[PDB]
A paper describes a structure:
Vacuolar/archaeal-type ATPase (V/A-ATPase) is a rotary ATPase that shares a common rotary catalytic mechanism with FoF1 ATP synthase.
Two maps of V2ATP and V3ATP showed an apparent density for ATP binding to each catalytic site on ABsemi when contoured at 7σ (standard deviation). The atomic displacement (B) factor of ATP binding to ABsemi in the V2ATP and V3ATP was in the range of 30 to 59 and 41 to 77 Å2, respectively, although Vsemi1ATP showed a higher B factor range of 112 to 133 Å2. Nevertheless, our results indicated that V2SO4 and Vsemi1ATP finally transformed to V3ATP (ATP/ADP occupies all three AB) by sequential binding of ATP to the catalytic sites.
Residue numbers in the entry:
A (entry chain C): 194 to 386
B (entry chain B): 1 to 578
C (entry chain J): 61 to 187
D (entry chain G): 169 to 209
E (entry chain D): 5 to 474
F (entry chain E): 3 to 319
G (entry chain I): 81 to 120
Amino acid sequence: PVQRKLDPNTPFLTGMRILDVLFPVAMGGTAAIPGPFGAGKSVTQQSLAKWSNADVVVYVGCGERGNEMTDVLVEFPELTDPKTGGPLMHRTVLIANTSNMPVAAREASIYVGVTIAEYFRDQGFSVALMADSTSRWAEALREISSRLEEMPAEEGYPPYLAARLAAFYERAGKVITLGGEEGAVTIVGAVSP
Amino acid sequence: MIQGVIQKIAGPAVIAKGMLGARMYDICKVGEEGLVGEIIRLDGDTAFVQVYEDTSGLKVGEPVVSTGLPLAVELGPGMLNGIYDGIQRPLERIREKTGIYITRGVVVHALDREKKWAWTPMVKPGDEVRGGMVLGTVPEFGFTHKILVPPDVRGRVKEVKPAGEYTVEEPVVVLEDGTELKMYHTWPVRRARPVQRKLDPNTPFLTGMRILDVLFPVAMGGTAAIPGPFGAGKSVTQQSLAKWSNADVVVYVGCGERGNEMTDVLVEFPELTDPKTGGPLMHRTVLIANTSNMPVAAREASIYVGVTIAEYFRDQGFSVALMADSTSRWAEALREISSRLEEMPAEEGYPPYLAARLAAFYERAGKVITLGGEEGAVTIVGAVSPPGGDMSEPVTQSTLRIVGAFWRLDASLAFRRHFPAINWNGSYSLFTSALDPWYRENVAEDYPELRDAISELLQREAGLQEIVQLVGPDALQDAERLVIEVGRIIREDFLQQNAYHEVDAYCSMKKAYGIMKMILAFYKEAEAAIKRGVSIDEILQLPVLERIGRARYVSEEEFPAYFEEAMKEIQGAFKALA
Amino acid sequence: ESAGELLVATARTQARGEVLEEVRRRVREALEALPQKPEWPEVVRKLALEALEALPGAKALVANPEDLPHLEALARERGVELQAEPALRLGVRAVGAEGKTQVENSLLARLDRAWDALSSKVAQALW
Amino acid sequence: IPGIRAQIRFIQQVLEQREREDTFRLKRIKGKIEAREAEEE
Amino acid sequence: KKEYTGITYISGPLLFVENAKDLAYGAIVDIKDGTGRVRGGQVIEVSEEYAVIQVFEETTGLDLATTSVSLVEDVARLGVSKEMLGRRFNGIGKPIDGLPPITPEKRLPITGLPLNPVARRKPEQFIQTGISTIDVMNTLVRGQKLPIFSGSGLPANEIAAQIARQATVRPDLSGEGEKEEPFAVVFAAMGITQRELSYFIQEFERTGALSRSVLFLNKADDPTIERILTPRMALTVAEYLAFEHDYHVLVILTDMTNYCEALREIGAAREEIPGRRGYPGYMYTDLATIYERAGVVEGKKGSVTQIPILSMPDDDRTHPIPDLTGYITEGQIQLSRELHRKGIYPPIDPLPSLSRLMNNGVGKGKTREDHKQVSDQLYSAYANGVDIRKLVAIIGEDALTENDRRYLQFADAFERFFINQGQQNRSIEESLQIAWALLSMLPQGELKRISKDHIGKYYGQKLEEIWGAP
Amino acid sequence: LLKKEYTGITYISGPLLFVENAKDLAYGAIVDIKDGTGRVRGGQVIEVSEEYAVIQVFEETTGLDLATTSVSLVEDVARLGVSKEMLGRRFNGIGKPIDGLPPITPEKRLPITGLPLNPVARRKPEQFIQTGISTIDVMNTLVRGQKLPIFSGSGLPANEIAAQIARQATVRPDLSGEGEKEEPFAVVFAAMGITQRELSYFIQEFERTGALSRSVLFLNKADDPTIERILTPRMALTVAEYLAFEHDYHVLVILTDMTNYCEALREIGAAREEIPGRRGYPGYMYTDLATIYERAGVVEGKKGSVTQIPILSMPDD
Amino acid sequence: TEALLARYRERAEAEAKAVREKAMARLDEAVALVLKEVLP
Ligand SMILES: Nc1ncnc2c1ncn2[C@@H]1O[C@H](COP(=O)(O)OP(=O)(O)OP(=O)(O)O)[C@@H](O)[C@H]1O
Ligand SMILES: Nc1ncnc2c1ncn2[C@@H]1O[C@H](COP(=O)(O)OP(=O)(O)OP(=O)(O)O)[C@@H](O)[C@H]1O
Ligand SMILES: [Mg+2]
């Protein structure tokens, strides 16, 4: 819960010129970064995590490589936080569900990450929720729907894929917390068409 | 055996109750008529049967008896000179019995059970026998047929029938175990026949065609595909191979042919002569003739029946050639069957296991050391028919991944009446490397290099055609026009063949080599002349050009002189030039 | 080239294979010679008991006629039937109450199922 | 020409996927009809 | 006959009957309602529990209380006799011409038996359709399966009726020549409208072609099962005549597209999963069992020839029905909408047309010696003419060579006098005369595909023979 | 130690077999299927309930009858007998020697499905493999712990490059210059749906250049059972992981023609009436291929490695 | 050279004979272990 949703009016400084000037995102806003393999989704989102002006960053590895999680683990401890000088990893929360870990764990991990981000929002901070692949969450939903023997809508996905995505992305926003403070959760969700 | 009764008839689907004990994919005779079918499902005390023939007239309660064996062929004396359907039914005998139509449910034995055979035994009592050994020989036209022991049999000989004339049903040999070995045995068509080893091919499958036997060779035991759009020229090449190929036995499979197209083969072949012996060609041939109106099961099983027969003749020590005409038709039959079982299509309506079946068919080819200890080979040449003429079809793509030679027939060439339509840019052969030793050791070590030279000339011609497109050939300089002229010569006088022609339908290795050396020497002399500084336009008039042109039609026995005369004329016509 | 070393290695592998096959042959011959000793009834009794334990709802027992005089008591003790059969030696098989299940305990079966690890053990012991 | 060919291939693939989905729906309705007949005749 | 009353289900075209284990699969039944009206049906599934009957027409008044079923025959059979010549039947054999029912010599199964491949003989004699584009450029040969591919608005019906009205054999050309032999036309119409029905009836009546033909006419508003049965009935009559009374029969199947659509609907009614594009997975085999019933047998002087007519759904030759027909048949005759809108009848486009067995039926002793070469030369000349015709729109006539203008005039004259013959019946001789009169417009020597003997013999005839009176 | 046989077979239909009284068959178990003729076919439990268990017969079910057929359990989870003496040997994709030498004495039996590597347990790949090919070594460098497929075409020479890397792959300890001596290197070769011609070629190359001594070959032909193609990469990677993380080996796995693997996967998926995907391929193909590929890497505190080079052929480029 | 190949062949034969000789001394122990293990 939250007292009130506000109107995003302060930029989410990504550190990337093209994004920060041509296609900005506000502090409580939502962004999608679709692209084919080799386009630069993981590099863009890790760059966001290294240089963004967010207080806390929750990186969700939803059905992606384990190398991309160990890289964060091994390198972020030795990078310096832009806004507090301390080690970068101290402001980061990692949710990892690699490609060959269980499938429904992806559905679990997206909600776990958004809940952690919402918690730190309620603490008065400004949070960035980088979701590494919503496509794998969609795939996990498709698999479970096949197990339930339901009717797929298109390409096999259950007809309620859009509702779930809407909820997940609607968790975001700059709000006045229940405690009178102000916080924001920003979601940058990658898509693997 | 398991015997039951029909519960339910719905289309070609039949459910029989009381079949507890019936095996999967066994052959059953359904109804009073005796309609044949296979078990595709088992459910408790019920077996689902697909009837090959129409089921109109069946009623509930009628009997159903299981043969107990899967679809299998009868292998033994009598296959040669035979015309069968796709499940080994002798069409000639069915005609003798039934008139012009094939009445439903007629049963006729694949091997004539009334004929005698001169049985010459080879084993003696007390001998040990293992799968594939030769119990005794039986004459069959110009071959010595070998009565092999079935692959899955063992034991020691108790009794051997003395020499004489016996029918196929006679127990020619009896084991100590009491098992009776007759002149024929049955083998499932979907089980590959075991062999002792499989070898890398090393000798060519001379098809009597210049382009194939020179630039795109196929080995004895290799696999080749011959695709092309409609009217491309694939049936005629199939038949040309069947006529002049180097194979000891030929198995020709027509899987979904048109009625009149099948009549063409059925009537033409009996007249043709065999090169080796001079007798009828049919005495070295087994024809499987399926038309588009025969049951789907027969069409599906055609290629398997053919491969099993070819494997048998391999195990006898012979070298066999199997020609599958329009394997696109077999693929369509497979698709129809899969539809009738309500399977999920993959790609263009084909089942997701089409590639597996194509592999189970083509991978059976190869040169082997048979179980008996003699070398035999099976070579497969299958034709494909892309719907739109595009090699993107699943059948063609699956074939590519397994065939060692690809013989692309191009519709553009065909519209120009360039027969064979074998596009040399798209065709390829993966045996070309491994067959060089045979050519080197049989005629000359320079044959491979002359081949590479001819190919390089073809490529150079291919490059310049872009120039010749913008401007007529005459504008090109001397060197370019010379390569264009030698390319025209090479195409029209070495790569082109007429299957119908009396003398041009066949070419030997030495003759093709001679024509290659003739053309290449002419090219070298023209190069020397252009270097000397003579006009190429003077070359166009030399009668040696006409000498090259007629080198196609010269008889085989006439060449060993025509070649020396042409070589002398090559020397003179140029040296005498100003 | 090292084809000589390859020859040596393949010869060593062949020799070790011969040793293992000799071990297998000796083991199977000894097992088949076991019923010649008076201790075979007790092992088969234990094996039948284990098989029954494997079937909580067992209904029947099967063995060769010479085995029955020793297994009738157990069948009475465990409450099941027993009929003679041309079955395998050196063990006893059962049948489930529904009748669709079976369990077999021939010593050759135990040898087959244990060879995977017995082979490693014997290879380590030998060399 | 290559562009138009790419478009043709894309449309063929999308249409074929639609056909596969319809076949799946048909198979499921046939199975459900079988279930209803088995439980109710 | 026995009567069944245990009706337990009536939905769509299907009704279920209990205790009916004596019904044979495929048996034809009669459903009598409470009012005494009788409807026909076919047993599509026989089981111990019940039998499923596909009811023709409709079930607007049936009930589970009074309805009753009965057996008509274990298998669909047609009473066939030589007296059918000159009669009109509905599609399941019922006369529609108002004359008394025929007296059967024998009742044959509709689902004919496959012909043994070894029993056939190679086609070797030609049918003269009276249409130049066919007889000359895409000859029709006895025992062939040569379809007419058409579009939505093109006149396939007119061409079919004209060929029926004009088709004949030419024994006098056969070797030393012969006087006469039997000939008949079995016309099958599937899913035709009232307008097409009236057209066919008037055309077959007003020229006497009825006396040598048998008409099966299945209307659009008639049952679909009758549509499925119509082609098989026609082919049963054709085989009877051809192979038991030595008739050369020409079978015309008016709309195979309608047949395939009805087959699709029937298959869906029987709860069968479709194949590609929604059509049944066994459409190839059904079309084969229809088409492949023509041919010529060894030892028999009769013949059966087919001219199926297929209206391509969207001009699409890749549509499944034309593709399968192309696999099974031996050529195709293509109508072109351009020639139709230009006012040319019959609008047969030579360039996409073919006849695979053309070579067999044309040559010395059958037609004329120059037939092949004349056809080849006409094809090549027309192709060059169409190309140059496109080029003129950009480059204008002046910049073209004299040969190019000659080819242009050849293309125009060909479309105007050879392709466009109208309703005039042309013997092969007149067709070849027109062909030579047109080829003469080009200079000798440009005719590379015609030997010098034929050019010397036939060249030079005045174009005015046809230009003076088209 | 005992064998238990189930004979309550109620339904055979295509690749599936239902067993009624099968409450003790675990999901994913491997079973043997014994027919009247006596021959044994392998199956797997793909669904288990209180009513019956569903078994997928690894080969076609011709010859099975409900009166005689019986199903016995092999093992709870698929396992492969691994040993350090598999080097310089040839197998068939189900783990059976095809080189004529006797079977290998197992040192361990590890599950063929493997287990996921903890992301915390990995380390970043940091060391260079010298493939001997300039473009790869200079512009597309391969690193110990990397999975770097070669996207081939219809007729391109993928097999030639695979063999060339197998011959020429080298670690090059000298340039590292960390003071240690030369380190062990091995090549595991997995061929799926390979023709007899290509099998002969691969054997010729490996045996000709002598890389066979340092190589393990898992060869699967195109006329073999379909599911033996699915198990080939898993067994190859089990041997690779064994060597790498129990004997400090540097194994280069070369999987050839993954296109064949995905085709076999489509066949097996369409066997059990599962919803299809982009072109008929199963909707779980991403997870399956990830299961095969993500088994490459270098772990923390261990000096082995697994590098994969999946060679596939792009349909119609 | 053929001499080195012959020497390797002799080495292989010696290795096989040595393997057999080493094995014979303990085969009875292995058989006893196997029998004890398999038995109930
Ligand atoms: N901003 C960048 N600067 C430099 N290199 C980049 C950049 N973005 C991407 N790359 C290059 O692209 C490669 C792939 O990028 P990235 O890891 O972001 O892929 P991705 O789009 O997430 O793809 P996938 O679907 O495989 O996960 C990176 O390894 C790097 O080589
Ligand atoms: N080698 C040749 N010599 C002479 N004529 C040839 C040759 N190849 C093709 N032709 C001509 O081209 C025609 C092509 O017919 P062919 O039966 O070979 O076709 P196809 O490619 O098998 O086609 P389809 O898919 O219709 O069966 C032949 O009838 C003949 O007219
Ligand atoms: Mg990425």
